[PDB]
Amino acid sequence: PQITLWKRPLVTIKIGGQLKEALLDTGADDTVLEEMSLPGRWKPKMIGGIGGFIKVRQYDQILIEICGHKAIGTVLVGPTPVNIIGRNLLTQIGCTLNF
Amino acid sequence: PQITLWKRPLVTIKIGGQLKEALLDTGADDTVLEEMSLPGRWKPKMIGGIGGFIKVRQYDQILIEICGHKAIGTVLVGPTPVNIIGRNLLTQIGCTLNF
Numbered sequence: 644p645q646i647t648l649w650k651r652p653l654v655t656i657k658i659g660g661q662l663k664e665a666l667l668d669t670g671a672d673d674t675v676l677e678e679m680s681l682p683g684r685w686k687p688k689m690i691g692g693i694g695g696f697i698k699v700r701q702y703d704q705i706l707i708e709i710c711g712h713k714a715i716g717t718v719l720v721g722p723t724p725v726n727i728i729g730r731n732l733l734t735q736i737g738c739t740l741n742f
Numbered sequence: 743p744q745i746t747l748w749k750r751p752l753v754t755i756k757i758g759g760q761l762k763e764a765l766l767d768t769g770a771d772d773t774v775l776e777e778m779s780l781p782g783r784w785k786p787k788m789i790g791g792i793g794g795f796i797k798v799r800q801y802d803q804i805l806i807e808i809c810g811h812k813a814i815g816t817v818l819v820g821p822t823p824v825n826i827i828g829r830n831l832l833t834q835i836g837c838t839l840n841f
């Protein structure tokens with residue numbers, strides 16, 4: 644697709660068999676979803692946003708589908724206000740900015 | 743240009759007679775810059791996201807140049823950790839996401 648930016652670039656993702664809404668975010672280095680269960684072990688990470696840093700759980704090698712495009716990569720889980728698809732998965736699905 | 747997302751999409755902007763580096767941020771509704779002076783009237787605003795809320799000054803009808811593309815819009819100024827070009831100005835330069 645080509646997605647314009649007059650509204651938030653929200654898309655449907657699928658993770659753990661569940662559909663969620665998430666923001667395609669070129670300003671985010673990594674992908675972070677609101678609290679949920681994922682398989683396997685997790686490692687600690689902090690990420691910084693507009694108001695400061697939060698602690699999240701880092702899960703690696705997770706299956707996630709973004710607008711129908713299958714990806715496998717790192718997904719953070721924590722106290723984010725919105726589900727965010729960051730550059731790590733945007734690059735996987737072939738996303739670029741164009742003007 | 744076509745900008746890939748292996749690295750942060752940082753570009754040079756020109757604003758208030760100054761050159762600065764800023765992030766092209768599809769996950770931002772608004773444009774927010776680190777402390778600087780801008781001309782004209784402003785009103786206070788709170789923005790919140792990851793890590794909570796900051797207070798900013800909202801300036802309207804501000805001229806900016808982003809990668810050689812001119813635009814006008816609202817610019818927020820305050821203690822953001824990074825200069826952010828949000829959708830309100832990304833639309834004006836015809837910036838889209840593509841995959």
Ligand SMILES: Cc1cccc(C)c1OCC(=O)N[C@@H](Cc1ccccc1)[C@@H](O)C[C@H](Cc1ccccc1)NC(=O)[C@H](C(C)C)N1CCCNC1=O
Nearest residue numbers: 670671672673690691692693724769770771789790791792
């Ligand atoms: C930088 C980073 C590293 C690792 C992982 C992640 C997810 C990372 O990104 C975290 C992050 O908050 N990035 C922001 C820009 C960023 C990068 C680096 C440091 C600080 C910020 C931005 O892109 C997304 C984030 C999304 C959001 C969150 C809560 C509510 C609404 C939107 N958007 C916002 O905060 C914007 C701001 C910038 C005007 N925003 C907040 C007011 C309401 N609407 C809105 O759009």
Ligand SMILES: [Cl-]
Nearest residue numbers: 647648649650
């Ligand atoms: Cl749109």
Ligand SMILES: [Cl-]
Nearest residue numbers: 716717731732
């Ligand atoms: Cl990854």
Ligand SMILES: [Cl-]
Nearest residue numbers: 814815816830
């Ligand atoms: Cl605007």
Ligand SMILES: [Cl-]
Nearest residue numbers: 647648833836
């Ligand atoms: Cl358009």
